[PDB]
Design a protein around this ligand. Structure first.
Ligand SMILES: CCCCCCCCCCCCCCCCCC(=O)OC[C@H](CO[C@@H]1O[C@H](CO[C@H]2O[C@H](CO)[C@H](O)[C@H](O)[C@H]2O)[C@H](O)[C@H](O)[C@H]1O)OC(=O)CCCCCCCCCCCCCCCCC
Ligand code: CLA
Ligand code: CLA
Ligand SMILES: CC(C)=CCC/C(C)=C/CC/C(C)=C/CC/C(C)=C/CC/C(C)=C/CC/C(C)=C/CC/C(C)=C/CC/C(C)=C/CC/C(C)=C/CC1=CC(=O)C(C)=C(C)C1=O
Ligand SMILES: CCCCCCCCCCCCCCCCCC(=O)OC[C@H](CO[C@@H]1O[C@H](CO)[C@H](O)[C@H](O)[C@H]1O)OC(=O)CCCCCCCCCCCCCCCCC
Ligand SMILES: CCCCCCCCCCCCCCCC(=O)OC[C@H](COP(=O)(O)OC[C@@H](O)CO)OC(=O)CCCCCCCCCCCCCCC
Ligand SMILES: CCCCCCCCCCCCCCCC(=O)OC[C@H](COP(=O)(O)OC[C@@H](O)CO)OC(=O)CCCCCCCCCCCCCCC
Ligand SMILES: CC1=C(/C=C/C(C)=C/C=C/C(C)=C/C=C/C=C(C)/C=C/C=C(C)/C=C/C2=C(C)CCCC2(C)C)C(C)(C)CCC1
Ligand SMILES: CCCCCCCCCCCCO[C@@H]1O[C@H](CO)[C@@H](O[C@H]2O[C@H](CO)[C@@H](O)[C@H](O)[C@H]2O)[C@H](O)[C@H]1O
Ligand SMILES: CCCCCCCCCCCCO[C@@H]1O[C@H](CO)[C@@H](O[C@H]2O[C@H](CO)[C@@H](O)[C@H](O)[C@H]2O)[C@H](O)[C@H]1O
Ligand SMILES: CCCCCCCCCCCCO[C@@H]1O[C@H](CO)[C@@H](O[C@H]2O[C@H](CO)[C@@H](O)[C@H](O)[C@H]2O)[C@H](O)[C@H]1O
Ligand SMILES: CCCCCCCCCCCCO[C@@H]1O[C@H](CO)[C@@H](O[C@H]2O[C@H](CO)[C@@H](O)[C@H](O)[C@H]2O)[C@H](O)[C@H]1O
Ligand SMILES: CCCCCCCS[C@@H]1O[C@H](CO)[C@@H](O)[C@H](O)[C@H]1O
Ligand SMILES: CCCCCCCS[C@@H]1O[C@H](CO)[C@@H](O)[C@H](O)[C@H]1O
Ligand SMILES: [Cl-]
Ligand SMILES: [Cl-]
Ligand SMILES: [Fe+2]
Ligand SMILES: [Mg+2]
Lengths: 34, 34, 37, 30, 34, 40, 342, 37, 80, 334, 36, 63, 34, 37, 31
């Protein structure tokens, strides 16, 4: 199938950028003193 | 008082003895003509 | 230099992480077809 | 490449279901 | 081969002279260790 | 049978055995003759 | 308890002028023979029958041109043992066949193992951490990849480096012409590690020597240090300020500094070894495909990358007939690539 | 007798010997084998 | 120190030079003769200036067989 | 204090986050000019007629290069050693075709780097340090002068200066080998000894100090937290390091004096790189590497090749191919 | 181009003057110990 | 620590931590097997290498 | 230029994956107490 | 379950982040040309 | 896309220089 050649990077960055943002925030919350 | 033959003595001579021999050999080579 | 008193800690609890990841992954599952076209 | 991308996203989702169920923050009565 | 003797002739005469000049001090070292 | 290279192999095997044997014999001998001195 | 092993152990580990140890049993004979083999070959031994080259002082070569050359290509990867099926115990023929090359390479290899074992042994006995042995893994990675793995992937030992100054220079130029080895990112990391290492050596030495505390009256400042002194001989605080203001960043931690000094050149050499493992299989960074497609279609498109390939093409055509005599190359004048006039 | 011949004389004579032998090697670069002639 | 006599002590001593004014020249002369007698050529199989080529030959005697290499060199040396 | 006095005080202030200084007054604008021009040119410059034969070489990213092939291309052979500032061109289009950016960059860079060296003396003086760090930096500086200035002067053209790029660098090296046999030149060999040895001694010193760090930390933490910035006590045991290295080789082959050790670490690579710089600067005037081509001859007079002659065959390949359209006459005399 | 030349000539002179007069402004005294 | 049915069955197999035979034990016999293994590796290397050539052993695709 | 179409995604992930890993570690270090 | 006592906090200081990002970016700047080929 | 990629990585490196210098962990004297 002749799909758009930027579709892969568009999807990968769409997933990775905000997921990473969330992962960063979660892990630094856990590491805070309880 | 000091020993004469040691491990150090052997190590020194394993290098010194062939070196002088080789130097005499290479000295002689300087007079060889084609 | 004296510390800024306006600074606050930031949090994201585990449930929020899971809710957020679900949002991102399902959005990508939805939009990916259109990105590939 | 597209199919890999679709299957990958799907697989990440199922993995998320797993962690969200079995490795949830346990509800606690204070 | 005759050259083998001619080449090693100075070497053996040097080793012998070294032994003669060290034998009183070599026997003394070996007897001290034993 | 014993090809020339199998003979060569045995020769190399024995030469290494002899080199290693003599080396350790000489080192063991010298070690026994010139012992280290320790406090009782 | 105090058997022959323990007695032998005592003697091996005596505090003497040249430490021996258990590792010395491997190290000293192999190192001595490697060096002895090299000196013997370069003084007396030809490369006439393997390469069509003179290679010894006896033949008229000088220090820069002598070599212990690799065996002929027809030898394949023969271990070429003296008692092997090629030389059959004949020492003269063995020399003529390049037996000294495998002799030096193999004793050299076991020698380096012994040296690194020596590094481990001494460190254990003196009670220091074995970082020196670890750093020596880089010289080992280099020797093994270049002198063993490279020729093993190629047709024969023939294409391994020959043990000589000019012969090594030939190896460099061969790698440029045939492998375009300068274009390889693993070689580039190697270059960064070596030049970066040399930089770190120079800058750290100079910094220490120029931030010294005055601990004596002498204008010659070397005597104003005692090995057993507790105090640092130079100011880390002053050194740190200087560099922070000059370069923007500076070391502040002395332990990090010195570890980084291990890390940089050690990692670089490791990277270069990985590149050579690839070249063993002709798995080169030779080309950029995009550059070639463009250049083929567009005869006005030129870059320094395309310029360097033309040089490689010249190197290959001009050096190959004499450098690879087993191929019996005859390139008539007319086929030789040449620019105008030259 | 351990100390009779002064070390500075030994160094000077040894050094001069090195210069002579290396000098001979350089002379040989211009004569006989390896001379190009 | 590790126990052995200092090198400086040794090389400045009369007994050292009594011994080595003999051993050093002897080894040097032995090396010289190794070359001057031509024995070096025959031990290692290194061609003399007159033994690289036959008079009319202008082809290098390259080894081309692995297991008949020894005989090839012998054949080459016969042709001289 | 008047305006000038306060300005002088600011310029020479030891409290600036980055020291300015008087050398800095020249260094800052020249390095900024060189940097800005370099970046713009590397990205966007059109092809440059390096060899003056109306054969423009593309160096920039937008004109079909990548990081590895890209370069700021040396100025035209038609210019030679002529000064070619922007205002000497009829237009920027001409300036670019002829490789004007190269000259702008290298002249600004060399001046700025010379002032970088001066600045290192200058701050050392302000801080009450000893003054010779700048002497260490003279080795790499001299090497930059060698490839960007001295070699072009000797050869009569900035077209033979080293290109400002990764592949252009290799081009410079290969052609240099063809024309000077640099590998066979003892100053380059000294240079190699300097950089190989500098790397060796770097790894050596790094490993020995790290090997003898005094235990100040637990298993679970980095040993680097065992040293605190500005502590008065030394962080490793040099006597133990010496005890190790003296046994690895022999006692008198190892340093027990830290000052002497660090001097050696400074001197080895610096001197070697000085010789490397001098190799290029003297091959600039065509005093070339050793030539042993056809040095070994048999009884009849047949040439018996050595590895030198095989080097020669490789060099001939580079020679005949380089700048394939530039030569009209049989000898390449510059 | 003439305007560019003049501008650069002025810029360069300015900075060169700063360097010369700057180092002439009692530089040996600008150190942390003996100000002479 | 938690006991399980399987843990109890396997208990004996993880109960002898640090248990040693006295002195040199079987080190001499180990050395002999190591020596023989070294000779074995040398043999197969030299066959693959064509340094050791045996009757009926043609080291090639054609056998 | 006719470059490899996977070059973009390869470069992007090569940068992002380890960079993100370090950012995760750094931020959760900062948020720890002392 | 009772806590696992083998658990340990993990650290990466600012300098390490900077050094790490530099390594990554510079490795990317180097290898990217070969990825695009 | 390649030019963009190369220029992007370069720009990120330059930004990193800025932060490494001006937003470094400040060196603090202790014992
Ligand atoms: C790490 C640090 C540790 C420190 C280093 C320690 C140093 C120890 C020294 C070990 C030395 C090993 C020597 C290996 C010799 C070799 O290999 O010699 C090569 C021989 C194979 O022989 C070759 O075989 C080739 C293919 O032949 C075959 O194909 C031909 C054409 O079709 C014919 O059919 C022919 O009859 C048939 O045999 C050609 O004939 C060659 O001329 C001939 O040399 O293999 C063999 O002996 C054995 C092959 C299998 C064992 C390989 C293990 C070791 C090698 C790893 C390196 C891999 C290299 C890959 C490059 C990347
Ligand atoms: C520890 C020191 C050491 C080491 C590791 C080596 C290792 C090597 N040598 Mg070097 N050598 C040494 C010291 C050493 N040598 C010394 C001191 C000398 C001076 C005599 C030499 C002179 C020398 C020459 C002339 C040559 C070598 C060669 C070799 C290679 C092949 C060796 C081999 O195949 O033997 C195989 C033997 C063993 C591995 C020993 C076997 C021991 C086992 C464990 C016991 C079994 C043996 C048994 C008792 C005997 C029964 C046999 C019976 C059935 C007939 C290898 C790189 C060859 C080479 O370099 O060719 C290119 C070669 O030609 N060596
Ligand atoms: C540079 C090489 C090198 C170095 C410095 C070390 C260092 C170390 N090794 Mg490793 N090892 C190596 C390579 C090396 N190893 C290789 C290539 C193998 C084979 C896979 C091994 C297998 C090995 C094991 C299984 C173990 C070690 C262990 C150790 C440690 C203890 C010392 C020891 O056991 O040495 C071993 C001795 C040597 C490497 C010297 C071998 C000399 C050989 C026998 C000479 C053979 C000559 C040969 C027959 C000639 C014929 C050649 C042929 C081509 C013709 C130490 C960290 C031990 C450790 O981790 O303890 C906690 C451990 O358990 N080593
Ligand atoms: C089979 C059989 C026979 C077995 C028997 C084996 C047996 C038992 C033998 C015993 C008998 C015996 C000894 C025989 C000897 C045989 C023999 C002569 C073998 C020779 C082996 C051989 C080829 C050796 C090669 C020679 C060699 C090692 C050369 C290198 C020497 C050399 C130039 C060393 C560098 C010296 C130097 C100036 C180093 C500086 C490096 C440097 C700046 C380090 C930084 C640094 C340094 C410090 O200093 C400290 C402090 C710190 C902090 C620090 O940063
Ligand atoms: C006491 C202990 C003894 C310790 C000895 C240890 C042994 C190791 C010695 C290795 C030395 C290797 C060099 C041999 C050179 C040689 O013999 O040339 C011998 C050659 C012989 O000269 C040639 O002779 C031929 C004979 O037909 C022809 O006449 C040629 O034309 C002629 O050039 O001499 C030269 O080339 C002159 C230059 C010699 C200088 C070499 C510099 C070596 C630098 C390498 C770095 C070594 C590290 C030292 C650190 C400083
Ligand atoms: C002196 C001749 C120049 C050769 C270079 C070696 C010294 C200068 C290089 C140092 C640059 C490193 C950065 C500064 C590092 C630094 O700050 O150094 C500091 C160091 C110690 O400083 P001091 O203040 O104690 O001594 C210097 C003066 O104040 C006099 O006391 O200086 C020296 O040791 C100078 C030694 C000169 C003695 C002569 C050396 C000759 C070497 C022989 C080279 C032969 C080459 C052979 C090749 C085949
Ligand atoms: C290329 C390296 C770069 C260095 C450039 C600096 C140039 C200055 C020259 C320094 C060169 C280093 C030599 C220091 C020399 C030095 O300056 O100190 C002088 C030192 C004085 O010692 P003494 O006269 O006190 O005698 C020693 C006895 O007292 C000890 O019992 O003599 C030696 O150590 C030389 C011994 C020759 C070695 C013969 C033994 C050979 C055995 C092989 C070693 C095996 C190594 C193990 C690995 C396998
Ligand atoms: C191979 C072999 C073997 C062995 C051997 C040997 C062990 C040898 C040796 C040897 C040797 C051991 C030698 C030697 C030598 C030497 C020499 C030849 C030298 C020299 C020198 C020189 C010439 C010097 C110079 C210089 C320098 C380096 C530096 C600076 C200055 C000068 C210039 C002084 C055997 C029988 C087992 C068996 C088979 C084979
Ligand atoms: C696409 C690329 C993505 C790469 C993904 C990489 C993921 C990396 C995950 C890092 C995991 C860190 O894991 C985290 O460690 C910290 C300590 O450092 C723990 O934190 C624990 O120790 C700290 C410090 O004593 C206490 O303040 C805290 O109360 C305690 O819970 C967290 O409970 C844990 O969640
Ligand atoms: C941050 C600073 C960075 C530095 C940036 C450099 C700025 C460069 C600006 C260049 C200005 C353009 O220069 C412009 O070019 C035209 C033609 O090309 C020139 O043309 C002019 O001079 C020539 C002189 O022979 C006449 O023939 C012509 O009739 C006249 O119009 C002028 O000199 C100028 O109007
Ligand atoms: C075509 C060129 C021909 C060359 C002619 C030669 C003339 C040389 C000119 C010398 C004039 C320089 O004179 C110099 O000026 C500066 C700035 O005003 C003075 O003033 C300075 O005083 C002190 C010196 O400790 C500084 O701390 C202060 O910052 C500054 O004001 C110097 O004390 C004075 O020595
Ligand atoms: C390519 C996609 C990447 C996207 C990048 C997104 C990065 C987002 C950055 C988030 C930074 C969080 O910022 C971080 O906040 C925590 C608290 O939450 C702060 O931490 C502070 O509060 C906590 C909790 O009271 C204390 O334990 C801690 O001692 C104190 O320093 C950190 O000092 C700060 O570094
Ligand atoms: C040189 C190979 C090293 C192998 C070590 C095996 C040691 S073997 C060991 O040796 C003891 C004394 O040392 C004896 O008491 C004992 O009987 C013997 O089994
Ligand atoms: C390192 C040198 C070791 C010496 C090797 C022994 C030489 S052995 C012997 O020597 C004869 C010379 O008369 C040759 O004719 C013969 O071919 C050769 O096998
Ligand atoms: Cl070119
Ligand atoms: Cl011309
Ligand atoms: Fe240091
Ligand atoms: Mg001569």
């Amino acid at each position: 199938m002749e799909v758009n050649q930027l579709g892969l990077i568009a999807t990968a960055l769409f997933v990775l950028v905000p997921s990473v943002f969330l992962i960063i925030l979660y892990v630094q919350t856990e590491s805070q003193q309880k | 008082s000091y020993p004469i033959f040691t491990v150090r003595w052997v190590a020194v001579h394993t290098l010194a003895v062939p070196t002088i021999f080789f130097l005499g050999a290479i000295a002689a080579m300087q007079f060889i003509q084609r | 230099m004296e510390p800024n008193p306006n600074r606050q800690p930031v949090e994201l609890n585990r449930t929020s992480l899971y809710l957020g990841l679900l949002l991102i992954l399902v959005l990508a599952l939805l939009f990916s077809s259109y990105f590939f076209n | 490449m597209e199919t890999i991308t679709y299957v990958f996203i799907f697989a990440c989702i199922i993995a998320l279901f797993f962690f969200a169920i079995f490795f949830r923050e346990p509800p606690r009565i204070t | 081969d005759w050259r083998v003797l001619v080449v090693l002739l100075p070497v053996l005469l040097a080793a012998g002279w070294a032994v003669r000049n060290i034998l009183p001090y070599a026997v003394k070292q070996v007897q001290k260790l034993l | 049978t014993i090809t020339p290279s199998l003979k060569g192999f045995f020769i190399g095997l024995l030469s290494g055995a002899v080199v290693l044997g003599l080396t350790f014999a000489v080192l063991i001998a010298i070690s026994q003759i010139d012992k280290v001195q320790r406090s009782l | 308890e105090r058997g022959w092993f323990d007695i032998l152990d005592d003697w091996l580990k005596r505090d003497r002028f040249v430490f021996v140890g258990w590792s010395g049993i491997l190290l000293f004979p192999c190192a001595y023979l490697a060096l002895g083999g090299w000196l013997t070959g370069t003084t007396f031994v030809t490369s006439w029958y393997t390469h069509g080259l003179a290679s010894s002082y006896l033949e008229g070569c000088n220090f820069l041109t002598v070599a212990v050359s690799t065996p002929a290509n027809s030898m394949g990867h023969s271990l070429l043992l003296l008692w092997g099926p090629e030389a059959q115990g004949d020492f003269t023929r063995w020399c003529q066949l390049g037996g000294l090359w495998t002799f030096i390479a193999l004793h050299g290899a076991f020698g380096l193992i012994g040296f690194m074992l020596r590094q481990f042994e001494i460190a254990r006995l003196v009670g220091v951490r074995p970082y020196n042995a670890i750093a020596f893994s880089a010289p080992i990675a280099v020797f093994v990849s270049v002198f063993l793995i490279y020729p093993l992937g190629q047709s024969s030992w023939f294409f391994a480096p020959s043990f000589g100054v000019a012969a090594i220079f030939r190896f460099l130029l061969f790698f440029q012409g045939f492998h375009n080895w300068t274009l390889n990112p693993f070689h580039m990391m190697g270059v960064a590690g070596v030049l970066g290492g040399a930089l770190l050596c120079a800058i750290h030495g100079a910094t220490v020597e120029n931030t010294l505390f005055q601990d004596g009256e002498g204008a010659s400042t070397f005597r104003a240090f005692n090995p057993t002194q507790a105090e640092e001989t130079y100011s880390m605080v002053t050194a740190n300020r200087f560099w922070s203001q000059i370069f923007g960043i500076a070391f502040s931690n002395k332990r990090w500094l010195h570890f980084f000094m291990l890390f940089v050149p050690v990692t670089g050499l490791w990277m270069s070894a990985i590149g050579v493992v690839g070249l063993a299989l002709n798995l080169r960074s030779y080309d950029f495909i995009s550059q070639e497609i463009r250049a083929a279609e567009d005869p006005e498109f030129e870059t320094f990358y395309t310029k360097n390939l033309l040089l490689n093409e010249g190197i290959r055509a001009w050096m190959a007939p004499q450098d690879q005599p087993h191929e019996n190359f005859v390139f008539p004048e007319e086929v030789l690539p040449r620019g105008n006039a030259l | 007798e351990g100390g009779r011949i002064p070390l500075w004389i030994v160094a000077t004579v040894a050094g001069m010997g090195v210069i002579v032998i290396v000098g001979l090697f350089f002379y040989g670069a211009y004569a006989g084998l390896g001379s190009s002639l | 120190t590790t126990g052995e006599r200092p090198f400086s002590d040794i090389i400045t001593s009369v007994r050292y030079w009594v011994i080595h004014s003999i051993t050093i020249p002897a080894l040097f002369i032995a090396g010289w003769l190794f070359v001057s007698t031509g024995l070096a050529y025959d031990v290692f199989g290194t061609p003399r200036p007159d033994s690289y080529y036959a008079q009319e030959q202008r082809s290098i005697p390259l080894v081309t067989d692995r297991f008949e290499a020894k005989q090839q060199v012998e054949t080459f040396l016969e042709q001289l | 204090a008047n305006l000038w006095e306060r300005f002088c005080n600011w310029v020479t202030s030891t409290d600036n986050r980055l020291y300015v200084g008087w050398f800095g007054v020249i260094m800052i604008p020249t390095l900024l000019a060189a940097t800005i021009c370099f970046v713009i040119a590397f990205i966007a410059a059109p092809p440059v007629d390096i060899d003056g034969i109306r054969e423009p070489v593309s160096g920039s990213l937008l004109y079909g290069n990548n990081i590895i092939t890209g370069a700021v291309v040396p100025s035209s052979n038609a210019i030679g050693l002529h000064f070619y500032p922007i205002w000497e061109a009829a237009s920027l289009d001409e300036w670019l075709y002829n490789g004007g950016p190269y000259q702008l960059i290298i002249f600004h860079f060399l001046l700025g780097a010379s002032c970088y060296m001066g600045r290192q003396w200058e701050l050392s003086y302000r801080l009450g340090m000893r003054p010779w760090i700048c002497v260490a930096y003279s080795a790499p500086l001299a090497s930059a002068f060698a490839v960007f200035l001295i070699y072009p002067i000797g050869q009569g053209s900035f077209s033979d200066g080293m290109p400002l790029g990764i592949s252009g660098t290799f081009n410079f090296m290969i052609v240099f080998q063809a024309e000077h046999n640099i590998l066979m030149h003892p100053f380059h060999q000294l240079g190699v000894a300097g950089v190989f040895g500098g790397a060796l001694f770097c790894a050596m010193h790094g490993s020995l100090v790290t090997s003898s760090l005094i235990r100040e930390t637990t298993e679970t933490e980095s040993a680097n937290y065992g040293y605190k910035f500005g502590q008065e006590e030394e962080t490793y045991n040099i006597v133990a390091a010496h005890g190790y290295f003296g046994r690895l080789i022999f006692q008198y082959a190892s340093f027990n004096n830290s000052r002497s050790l660090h001097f050696f670490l400074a001197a080895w690579p610096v001197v070697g790189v000085w010789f490397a710089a001098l190799g290029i600067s003297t091959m600039a005037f065509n005093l070339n590497g050793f030539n042993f081509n056809h040095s070994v001859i048999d009884a009849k007079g047949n040439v018996i090749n050595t590895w030198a002659d095989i080097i020669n065959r490789a060099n001939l390949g580079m020679e005949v191919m380089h700048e394939r359209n530039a030569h009209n006459f049989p000898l390449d005399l510059a | 181009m003439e305007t560019l030349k003049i501008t650069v000539y002025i810029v360069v002179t300015f900075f060169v003057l700063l360097f010369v007069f700057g180092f002439l402004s009692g530089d040996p005294a600008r150190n942390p110990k003996r100000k002479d | 620590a938690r006991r399980t049915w399987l843990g109890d069955i396997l208990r004996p197999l993880n109960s002898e931590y640090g248990k040693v035979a006295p002195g040199w034990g079987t080190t001499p016999l180990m050395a002999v097997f190591m020596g023989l293994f070294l000779v074995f590796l040398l043999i197969i290397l030299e066959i693959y290498n064509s340094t050791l050539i045996l009757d009926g052993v043609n080291v090639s695709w054609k056998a």
